[PDB]
């Protein structure tokens, strides 16, 4: 049932859903992933979410991706 969700902040303007899933893919299997965009406009809000099936995969991803560079900018991670 309830999956395990990860908040990814400080994303580059043109980091896409595809990109963020490609970046978090090696940490375990991804149930879902998206970069949050404004509706009316369609611009990256500067953050996104990645969801895993395993609690361990999420907890690990938070620690290994925290402060890691994605695009030309350092991302931060936390529980969602």
From Swiss-Prot:
Homooligomer; homooligomerization is induced by Zn(2+). Interacts with FASTK; the interactions leads to its phosphorylation. Interacts (via RRM1 and the C-terminal glutamine-rich (Q) sequence) with SNRPC/U1-C (via N-terminus); thereby facilitating spliceosomal U1 snRNP recruitment to 5' splice sites. Phosphorylated by FASTK; phosphorylation occurs after FAS ligation in FAS-mediated apoptosis and before DNA fragmentation. It is found in: Nucleus; Cytoplasm; Cytoplasm, Stress granule. Disulfide bonds: none annotated. It comes from the Eukaryota. Residues 4-80 form the RRM domain. RNA-binding protein involved in the regulation of alternative pre-RNA splicing and mRNA translation by binding to uridine-rich (U-rich) RNA sequences. Binds to U-rich sequences immediately downstream from a 5' splice sites in a uridine-rich small nuclear ribonucleoprotein (U snRNP)-dependent fashion, thereby modulating alternative pre-RNA splicing. Preferably binds to the U-rich IAS1 sequence in a U1 snRNP-dependent manner; this binding is optimal if a 5' splice site is adjacent to IAS1. The RNA recognition motif domains RRM 2 and RRM 3 are necessary and sufficient for binding to uridine-rich target pre-mRNA. The RRM 1 and RRM 2 domains are required for the localization to stress granules (SGs) and for the recruitment of TIAR1 and poly(A) RNA to SGs in response to stress. This is Cytotoxic granule associated RNA binding protein TIA1. It is linked to Welander distal myopathy: An autosomal dominant disorder characterized by adult onset of distal muscle weakness predominantly affecting the distal long extensors of the hands, with slow progression to involve all small hand muscles and the lower legs. Skeletal muscle biopsy shows myopathic changes and prominent rimmed vacuoles. Rare homozygous patients showed earlier onset, faster progression, and proximal muscle involvement. Amyotrophic lateral sclerosis 26, with or without frontotemporal dementia: A form of amyotrophic lateral sclerosis, a neurodegenerative disorder affecting upper motor neurons in the brain and lower motor neurons in the brain stem and spinal cord, resulting in fatal paralysis. Sensory abnormalities are absent. The pathologic hallmarks of the disease include pallor of the corticospinal tract due to loss of motor neurons, presence of ubiquitin-positive inclusions within surviving motor neurons, and deposition of pathologic aggregates. Expressed in heart, small intestine, kidney, liver, lung, skeletal muscle, testes, pancreas, and ovary (at protein level). The chain holds residues 104 to 182 of 386 of the full protein.
